[PDB]
């Protein structure tokens, strides 16, 4: 059966056990990519650092 | 009063409070950068990822 479900980003992500754009996420301190799989949960989440874009990296990476 | 203490660099450590070549460490799964003075002990330790040295890179730097 095809039921269409309407609520909020989180409310959906619970229900559909996949993370959807929205939703609330939890951060570790330990980065996402050294979790094993059974470690893994939909919605972990990981804010980089940040980098500035110059001119010097429109030239170099053309 | 000046004295020589002799053992092993983990004793020397020890007897110091600071670490010395050879002395045993500790690992943590957090980065050292990420803690504060107070957190921070002598002897908190990271092992890096590799980087393989190609003649690419000696004539990059150069």
């Given at each position: 059966q095809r039921t269409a479900v309407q609520g909020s980003p989180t409310m959906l992500a619970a229900i559909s056990k996949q993370w959807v754009r929205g939703a609330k996420v939890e951060e570790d301190r330990?980065?996402?990519?050294?979790?094993?799989f059974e470690e893994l949960?939909?919605?972990?989440s990981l804010l980089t650092p940040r980098r500035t874009m110059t001119e010097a990296d429109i030239v170099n990476f053309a």
């Open positions: 330990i980065h996402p990519f050294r979790k094993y949960q939909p919605g972990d």
